[model samples]
Target: SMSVKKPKRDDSKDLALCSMILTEMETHEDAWPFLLPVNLKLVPGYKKVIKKPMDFSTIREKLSSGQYPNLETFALDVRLVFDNCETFNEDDSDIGRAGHNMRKYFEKKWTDTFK
Candidate 1:
């Protein structure tokens, strides 16, 4: 008789990859602006405009705490950080350019590793 068994992913491997990618992003020079939650005091309308604000610090916490159930989820959060940056900053601004650069870096690494 033939059996249909679902395959399971090796979460340990996924976690390690996620951690490494996060470390690289954390150390990136442009990472300064994204190191923590946005300061609401300075960026007054940030919270109101960006409903789901994501930063490297928050992503690190979620990854380490095992809140991300899959690699795709991890990728989504990473992308969210860039998306948020673009949304709140002008394309020609420092933060905006940094976000674009960071996004390019991550995508290259991501494709080279998994694609």
Candidate 2:
């Protein structure tokens, strides 16, 4: 009788990144606060969206009304995470390497997750 060996379990790290972002959203201020501004600036012909200063009430209204789609929300959240990563001031090269590895890990995990 031939028996197949079980493959190693997938250690998908994007799940970890997603988890980290979710946790940070609960605790971090200014997370994704720049989203509307950035989106308005980047999206062609959408400059009118941010022509006026953004207020919390308006932002909340837009968010609650489903103005942004799921992918847009995810993109804004992920962008905030990357912005936070840039401000990480660890002095160790190992820490920097670890950060790069974590990003690579997440990218691979995301690909696998969607597949």
Candidate 3:
């Protein structure tokens, strides 16, 4: 008799990053085909919770999507989203690291878009 634990699916993290980037791309409507392949190839059976229209909120919408009207409070919420991936997942493992990296990418893209 033998027993072995299943491996972590946190390997899905990179796929999730690609998925998020595709979402950001889809807001503009030109990148669909390219984004589709990334979505399909990476995570074939995944079912994201948020539906597309709601999920694709613009950065401005996101910045304003919180409570507290102050820029400081908004920025704090922004920081909070990127601060702890483990809060959303099981542990600060591979998926968590991917989130940290994707958070960096997203901030840069946001800066370039707004500035």
Candidate 4:
């Protein structure tokens, strides 16, 4: 069986980076749809469609509370938000286009800061 392996490096720098990037993403124009969780009442079956719902607010809480062990873990949740949109929205739609733009911005930041 495969086991989880934790890295031994100090992650304080990564944590700061995550926090900084999160702020940038939150302020992005395309970030409007992802600022909060999807309203299940407004969009019926959204929970069913997106099994793992991720949003900026949730990610902010996690980051502030030290839930993310490293940059990669934080990145997963950020990516998940966009992935959920892709799964639930049409690419030509407003929400879908926003998700795409958000994804692109986040990835570019990820690369510039870390890679």
Which candidate's lDDT is highest?
4
Candidate 3 steric clashes: 0
User: In candidate 1, which residue pairs get closer than 3 Å at backbone N, Cα or C atoms, i.e. clash?
Assistant: none
Q: What local lDDT does model 1 show for residue 107? A: 96
- Model 1, span 5-99: residue lDDT tens: 66865566778987998899899898887899998778889979999989999999998897999899999999999999999899998999999
Q: Alpha carbon lDDT of residue 57, candidate 3?
A: 31
Residue 66 accuracy (lDDT) in model 4: 81
lDDT digits (tens) for residues 45-108 of candidate 2: 4354333343233444544565645433543544444444444424365544544544454456
> Which runs in model 3 stand beyond 4 Å of their true positions?
1-71, 86-92
**What lDDT does model 4 reach?**
0.90
Q: Tell me the lDDT of candidate 1.
A: 0.89
| Residue range 14-97, candidate 4, lDDT tens digits | 878888999999998778999998888899889777899989999999999989876778889999999999999999999999
The per-model lDDT (C-alpha) reads 0.89, 0.44, 0.42, 0.90
TM-score, candidate 4, is: 0.88
lDDT of 1 at 80: 94
Looking at candidate 3, the ten consecutive residues that score lowest on lDDT are 49-58
